Amino acid sequence: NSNVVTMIRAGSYPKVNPTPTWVRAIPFEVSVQSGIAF
Amino acid sequence: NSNVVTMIRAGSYPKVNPTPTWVRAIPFEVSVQSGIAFKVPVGSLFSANFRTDSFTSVTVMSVRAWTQLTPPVNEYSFVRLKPLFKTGDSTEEFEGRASNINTRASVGYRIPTNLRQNTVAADNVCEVRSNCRQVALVISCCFN
Amino acid sequence: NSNVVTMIRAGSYPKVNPTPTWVRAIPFEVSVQSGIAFKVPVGSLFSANFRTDSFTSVTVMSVRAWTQLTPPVNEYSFVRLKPLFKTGDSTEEFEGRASNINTRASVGYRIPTNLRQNTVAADNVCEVRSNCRQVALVISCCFN
Amino acid sequence: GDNSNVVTMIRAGSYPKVNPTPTWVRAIPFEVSVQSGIAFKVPVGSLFSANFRTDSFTSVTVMSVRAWTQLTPPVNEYSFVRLKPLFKTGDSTEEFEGRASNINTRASVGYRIPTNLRQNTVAADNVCEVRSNCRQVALVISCCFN
Amino acid sequence: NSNVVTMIRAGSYPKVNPTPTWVRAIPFEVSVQSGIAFKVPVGSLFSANFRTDSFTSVTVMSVRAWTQLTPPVNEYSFVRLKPLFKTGDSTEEFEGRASNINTRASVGYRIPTNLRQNTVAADNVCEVRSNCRQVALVISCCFN
Amino acid sequence: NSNVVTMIRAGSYPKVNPTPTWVRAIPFEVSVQSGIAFKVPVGSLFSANFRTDSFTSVTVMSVRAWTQLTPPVNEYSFVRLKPLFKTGDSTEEFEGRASNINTRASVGYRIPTNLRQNTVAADNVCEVRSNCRQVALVISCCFN
Amino acid sequence: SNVVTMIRAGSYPKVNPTPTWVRAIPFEVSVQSGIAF
Amino acid sequence: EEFEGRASNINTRASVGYRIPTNLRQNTVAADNVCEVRSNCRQVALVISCCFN
Amino acid sequence: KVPVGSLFSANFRTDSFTSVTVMSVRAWTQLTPPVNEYSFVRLKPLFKTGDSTEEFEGRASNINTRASVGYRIPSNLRQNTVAADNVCEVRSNCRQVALVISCCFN
Amino acid sequence: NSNVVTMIRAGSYPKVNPTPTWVRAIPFEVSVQSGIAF
RNA sequence: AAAAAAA
RNA sequence: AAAAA
RNA sequence: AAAAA
RNA sequence: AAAAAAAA
RNA sequence: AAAAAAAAA
RNA sequence: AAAAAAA
RNA sequence: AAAAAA
RNA sequence: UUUUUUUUUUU
RNA sequence: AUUUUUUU
RNA sequence: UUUUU
RNA sequence: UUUUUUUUU
RNA sequence: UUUU
RNA sequence: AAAAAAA
RNA sequence: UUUUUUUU
RNA sequence: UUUUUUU
Numbered sequence A, J: 001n002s003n004v005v006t007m008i009r010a011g012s013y014p015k016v017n018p019t020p021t022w023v024r025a026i027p028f029e030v031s032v033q034s035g036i037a038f
Numbered sequence B, C, E, F: 001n002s003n004v005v006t007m008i009r010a011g012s013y014p015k016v017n018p019t020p021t022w023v024r025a026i027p028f029e030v031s032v033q034s035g036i037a038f039k040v041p042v043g044s045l046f047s048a049n050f051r052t053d054s055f056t057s058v059t060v061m062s063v064r065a066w067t068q069l070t071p072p073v074n075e076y077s078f079v080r081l082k083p084l085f086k087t088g089d090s091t092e093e094f095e096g097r098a099s100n101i102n103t104r105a106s107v108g109y110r111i112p113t114n115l116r117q118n119t120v121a122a123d124n125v126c127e128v129r130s131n132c133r134q135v136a137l138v139i140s141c142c143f144n
Numbered sequence D: 001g002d003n004s005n006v007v008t009m010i011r012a013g014s015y016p017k018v019n020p021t022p023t024w025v026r027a028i029p030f031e032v033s034v035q036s037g038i039a040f041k042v043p044v045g046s047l048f049s050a051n052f053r054t055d056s057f058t059s060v061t062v063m064s065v066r067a068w069t070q071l072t073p074p075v076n077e078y079s080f081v082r083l084k085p086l087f088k089t090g091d092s093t094e095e096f097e098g099r100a101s102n103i104n105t106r107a108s109v110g111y112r113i114p115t116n117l118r119q120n121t122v123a124a125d126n127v128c129e130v131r132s133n134c135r136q137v138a139l140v141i142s143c144c145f146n
Numbered sequence G: 001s002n003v004v005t006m007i008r009a010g011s012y013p014k015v016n017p018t019p020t021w022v023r024a025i026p027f028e029v030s031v032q033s034g035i036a037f
Numbered sequence H: 001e002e003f004e005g006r007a008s009n010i011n012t013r014a015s016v017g018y019r020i021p022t023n024l025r026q027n028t029v030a031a032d033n034v035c036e037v038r039s040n041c042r043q044v045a046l047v048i049s050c051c052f053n
Numbered sequence I: 001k002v003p004v005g006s007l008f009s010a011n012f013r014t015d016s017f018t019s020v021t022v023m024s025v026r027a028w029t030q031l032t033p034p035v036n037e038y039s040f041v042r043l044k045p046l047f048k049t050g051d052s053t054e055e056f057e058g059r060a061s062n063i064n065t066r067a068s069v070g071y072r073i074p075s076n077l078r079q080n081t082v083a084a085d086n087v088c089e090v091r092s093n094c095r096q097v098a099l100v101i102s103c104c105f106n
Numbered sequence K, P, W: 001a002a003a004a005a006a007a
Numbered sequence L, M: 001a002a003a004a005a
Numbered sequence N: 001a002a003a004a005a006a007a008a
Numbered sequence O: 001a002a003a004a005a006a007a008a009a
Numbered sequence Q: 001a002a003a004a005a006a
Numbered sequence R: 001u002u003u004u005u006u007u008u009u010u011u
Numbered sequence S: 001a002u003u004u005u006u007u008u
Numbered sequence T: 001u002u003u004u005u
Numbered sequence U: 001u002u003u004u005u006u007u008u009u
Numbered sequence V: 001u002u003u004u
Numbered sequence X: 001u002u003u004u005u006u007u008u
Numbered sequence Y: 001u002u003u004u005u006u007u
Ligand SMILES: [Cl-]
Pocket: C023, C024, C140, M004, M005
């Protein structure tokens, strides 16, 4: 909504985490043989 | 109201900015020729005449135009505008004419939010076409 | 909203002003000696570092002060502000002291409407007294 | 509170802001000597005196001026008093006049200064001009010492 | 209101007083020795530095004190106040301590209405005990 | 009320007590050694410095502790409190630490009503452990 | 929540490594005839 | 994950914590490890809300 | 000049990205200031369509405490930035500055 | 009510006073003679 | 907002 | 149940 | 829905 | 606001 | 502002 | 709420 | 909330 | 405790 | 209520 | 308030 | 209602 | 309107 | 009266 | 309901 | 006036 950069009145240093978690669902394929469970 | 100086119970040192932004409406003029289009430089916005010689970039929001001189004999004043963008120039020729020969012609255009980026002095904002020899421009912009 | 440029049905040429006013909060520092009162010049407000080198006068509204450096050993920071006016200086000493030796001492004062006249660079805003060797000031004013 | 009969502890916090020489809104009564047919310029320095607890100030913002005739008028005449406000940016030409309807009664008049014209004045400056057929005029001035 | 002067229809001469009262908050510092109680003189309130050199008597309402200098090594600041009266000195030691060594220690006591009488320069307000070499006091009083 | 003395229509002689009880908060400091617990004696409450030298027994309701001096280098202050009773000593270690090296470490415990019996000067209140060498105490108790 | 979350901890809180604990203790005792234990 | 907390004052402690979801709230014996701790301070205080059984 | 290539790293699980849309930048002084001074930190937003001249400054009211400041990039200026680009300029009396940048990797 | 001790989350060192005031009703006797005030 | 007045 | 998306 | 204390 | 899994 | 202390006279 | 202040 | 009293 | 005219933002 | 006509 | 459709 | 202790905005 |  | 708030 | 947000 | 975990 604003057209220019605006200042952010920041305070104390927050709690951080450079390696967070992630909720995903992974699409990938596997090779299956007849009459055999992979 | 108070008629003398009043103490202010100040607290911690705040956040400051000696060089802030400035929303302005910058007026100037440009000389235009007949049948030829004039690319308006963004560098005209940065001058001491507008208190803007300290800025290097600006976010243009809307442009308006007026014919500054009288048109040729027997003609009515007109003025066209074609927006220019570094990612891609437009082919719109927003045009407004005068219904009185003694009266200016006026036309403008508004820049959408998605197309509101910064522009430096080496960039151009729009092209101007008119039958008058000078065009008055007012540009609403956000200096940063 | 919009995703493209749209035409502005502009009318007659408006009323323009290339060099408008500017209500600002100007931060800067001043060196102060122990036991000596330092007069803060209005000329420090006019600078390219504040985008105000195009102004020659300003209407000051309120002044706040903070101690920029550490106080002497065993001492807590303090700062005093004596307002100054061309029609007559004041004898107030708006003082603020820090309750922690590691923290700044802050104080300020507000100028009443009846005393909000223009001030040129040659004038002075207030005197500052402090045990620290530098003082930070934020001045809410109206450049014109 | 207001019912205690001994001293009570105050849980004070951080050291506050302070000002050992604050402002003061006052009404200052004093008198001036006036001659017949001549106008006397009331000095602002008459406000900075130890008799008013204001000898520590060096400037003041005047708000309103009220004048009364302090001495009896000439014989067969009624008391009158005039006031012409004075300003460093430009003196005025008004003559706010009040006459007594009884020879034994004072003559009073006054004028209020607008907010736009309420700046500071020093001892070298003047407030207004006083004219009267009486020889002495008592003045009461509302102002803000700073 | 107006932009000009307006006549005041004054009446009879009013009741005047060239030397009125004054309710003040007086800030002044004292020197305290280690383990020795310092009697704060009332005369410290009558001074030209407070505009009060025209008063001779004052009614004290509340006395609060702050440590003005740092405490000894390894120690937290503290300050005590024993109220004194001409009709009978007290034995209370209203003590306040600092939870941070870099922070002041503060405490105060209020004087009840039944004990709010005048005091002259020869009188003492209270005793002060502290581990710091100076104490800042802000005495709320009524000058008359 | 009024400004003069008034008559009291007193009746029969009332039930009187020249030596009544007194609930207080008694501030007193103790010396602690490194890595060694110190038993707080109840006789520290009975003192002419607390106006309680006329009492011989007291019912303690709660204990609160603060570190009175600075901690060892590189450490934050801590203080523990182990309640003691004549019917049976406790093994709780109500411990409070400081998040700032310059700030006091505080902790306290409350005694339930069923454990609020009298204690004489020969008894002990609690044990105090701390890396600091002095610990301030503020005990809320009932002198009887 | 099926994953670890971050707790924005503040100052160090009051701690007690040896609390009180309220219990109902079951045990048995040997009793003789006519004698109180 | 490396849930980190920093102190905004040199004299003040830095703090951070993490909550274990109910699905990952199994038992752990003495030979197990709760977490790893990194810091520029030579000692860290731990407060672990746990259910002994 | 803070490079954008500092956002793409395996330490942030972001070594698989090549561009990012920065939304807001916040800064904290990571070390103590010089003697007798308080910490300060400045930020000047940079853009490939035109750098800005703002100097969003934040100073500390305590010599032991960090300084902090931040700015928000408006939606109209929220485009992508590659590693060779820069986010902003930092000025401080302290020799290290901690940055927490809210952005959208894509 | 309770049956054991409870922890008090104390804070900063409060304002203390080892010698406070005391509102009392003091009962004592005096010796008075006939027709003379004491 | 500024100029008679009114108990 | 005007146009395009 | 935008600015500058 | 956020790609992914869901869902009258 | 927990008790002790005059009473809404 | 107390004091100083305008009709 | 003074001093007297259906 | 109640108005005629010189300009005059805003409902 | 995104764009282009028509629209008091 | 100040600067902008 | 007041003097000191504890609670809670 | 000035104070703590 | 014991675990994570108490707004 | 996982990561970033918005006037103490 | 939020509530959830073994005596
Ligand atoms: Cl402003």
